[PDB]
């Protein structure tokens, strides 16, 4: 029974910030924060792959109240402390330029979130989303293709699969399939949750594969900067082979633009066996096994 819209924007849950910690290490590009919120005093429950809304304070340029922005939940259903009391987000401060009006422009909700102080009250809505749900089958294979904050739902899956405290809390979900995260960020300091992702791979080398595309540190075979599409091309046959399994699910998450390259790579692999990827993919989407969340 998937929880949905336990809180709506006309009457959101007022949560309290517990912590706000930086995920981008020194020498990284930009600001991405792990923000944990207290859910006690309300009934907001959620599952892995879902999102919540945050309503920032203030009015827009037209004097109208700011509307919610959606953020993929970055914590498992139990929260980071496995106490069912919290929810966490993985929020990048949006910044861009020109041509324009002024200089650097800062996104309203993301700046609010990335600078929020512990103790602050936050308007939270949701949860929402049924497109990024993890299968209950402990034998499923799970391919995770993420860039930047697209890591968020992947963390919910991986923590539930691989954290000691999660395994203890979830007797009915003892993961024994194969998971493969291909994660594209510009620098090593930008590898969000690097230490924990690497701890998982070290502990579960037969159940979790971790592949990085680090654009400022790595070049693809054509001499271009390395992106997630390049790693998918590099492993296209293996990925296609995994995708052919009736129990394999694929998840794609992050800023828009990565899908075309991923499709081209898998299209070339499937074509070798006389399969039209775009058609096979349509069928996968219909079966709930091809999960995309780009923004
Ligand atoms: C399902 C879903 C899940 C999401 N999950 C996350 C997440 O986990 N983490 C996260 O950080 N974000 C996530 N987002 C994006 C998030 O919802 C916000 O859109 C983002 O944080 C920016 O909102 P803001 O209020 O800071 O910017 P706003 O003040 O709302 O400004 C956004 C506007 O800025 C302009 N703009 C944006 N980018 C550029 C650009 N590069 N160049 C020129 N103009 C630009 C556009 O006009 C855009 O409408 C998710 C979005 C969706 C839909």
Swiss-Prot record:
Q: Which cofactor does it need?
A: FAD
One GO biological process this protein is involved in is: electron transport chain
Name one molecular function that GO assigns to this entry: flavin adenine dinucleotide binding
Domain FAD-binding FR-type, by residue range, is 10-134
Write the record's keywords in alphabetical order, separated by commas. Answer: Antenna complex, FAD, Flavoprotein, Membrane, NADP, Oxidoreductase, Phycobilisome, Thylakoid
Similarity remark: Belongs to the ferredoxin--NADP reductase type 1 family.
The identity of this protein, by name, is Ferredoxin--NADP reductase
Shown stretch of the complete protein: 146 to 440 of 440
